[PDB]
Amino acid sequence: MVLKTVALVGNPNVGKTTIFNALTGLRQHVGNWPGVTVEKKEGIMEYREKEFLVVDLPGIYSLTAHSIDELIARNFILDGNADVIVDIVDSTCLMRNLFLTLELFEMEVKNIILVLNKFDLLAKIDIKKMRKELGVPVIPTNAKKGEGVEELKRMIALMAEGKVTTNPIIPRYDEDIEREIKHISELLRGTPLAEKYPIRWLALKLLQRDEEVIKLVLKYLGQEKMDEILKHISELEEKYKRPLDIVIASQKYEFLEQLLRKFVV
């Protein structure tokens, strides 16, 4: 088998480092990410005679363009350097943690696994449900003890082979948000971008005036059309008093408060 790559992502202090060590033993390398001071830890994970290169990404709260680390993550996942994405979540603050999961899902990743770390803290969550609801595997872990870790290795090894079905849930927004989404799409899908990036994502980012995406989408559209689009975005920014990143987030949180009611036994 070719050398598959596994990526560890999640918030800071969710036990990401703990699960990395838990998967790579002593076989770890230490370097830094291209052009920046951010350290980069990668290692070799073994399982059933199969070997995997595990890259641990710097902890992050979301996938915007407001920090090196969030951009280290989006660049790595988007450009396709990840065969398997292991999204690690601190089970004690599901709302905040699943918020990133959502941003990941929206980027249209499909080969992802959800680890509910620090799970060793008490209520009762119906994993079976979380799995059906989110549309991805969910493995509870007590990394600081090594529980579930083995179940993780198997599921990673299983996904790498392409024997795991997934369909990550995609949150829906206001008609107004969904309509402006639709127009950016049926105006961007008639562009080479669609071949390299997920349209839905690219639009969501534009509405939020993503520094980076707004730059790329400007390279294929005349400065003119980008103003017609920014203009419409400005009017959206009018209906909603608050700027768009906050409105999209507000709707993500509620989406989660709904999903969470379904998980909590």
Add this chain to the structure above:
Amino acid sequence: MVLKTVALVGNPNVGKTTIFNALTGLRQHVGNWPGVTVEKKEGIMEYREKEFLVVDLPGIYSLTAHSIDELIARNFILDGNADVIVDIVDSTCLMRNLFLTLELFEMEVKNIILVLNKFDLLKKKGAKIDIKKMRKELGVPVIPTNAKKGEGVEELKRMIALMAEGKVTTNPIIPRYDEDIEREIKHISELLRGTPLAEKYPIRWLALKLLQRDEEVIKLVLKYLGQEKMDEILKHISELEEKYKRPLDIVIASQKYEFLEQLLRKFV
């Protein structure tokens, strides 16, 4: 002092039980809420010889009509059984927790104290809460605690007793929804302004509930006010609903979080 009551409300596993034990020592009584299986715990809190009756309400994430537990807190507070309301919050997961805080505020509750628990785990992971600004922002006192270690508990009793004496002033910040939603709240409020109902419940609240078709509120307007009165309300709701594709309860909550993000920026 006359027997003052103190109610503890908050999400499950936040320290509510630990605070309850710290405040009541072993002077607790276990029983159950009227005509329901739900357990009801209560005990005596002492401070400079004054005695308080602390009641622990089942842990909840909001105050909808959707569950026994939420309705127990809903009713206990609204029917005036609480002289003081202590809202226990996990400092390491504010967004989730504060939603419930905004609800209590919307019930026009005023005698409330917010308790930032697990403050140790906060400054540990390297978080940063500006308590002084938060108190100014939310409009209620804010006490950092570490239930398990017992830190802040004594400062909590002080504030509690103080509020009971009526020596504390607050002005809970109230969220404001978009224009269209505020108007219908204005109407329903008006239509309820002069009633034996709006004289026992926060007009602003009763209104807000009705826009989401709150099961227990509707049955409250039929018993206190005519069936005709409830229909005059209906066209207003149906009316607003028309202005929104998603359900109202979803959009309202959505904007409630929208209110929270901007709220959290001001002190985190």
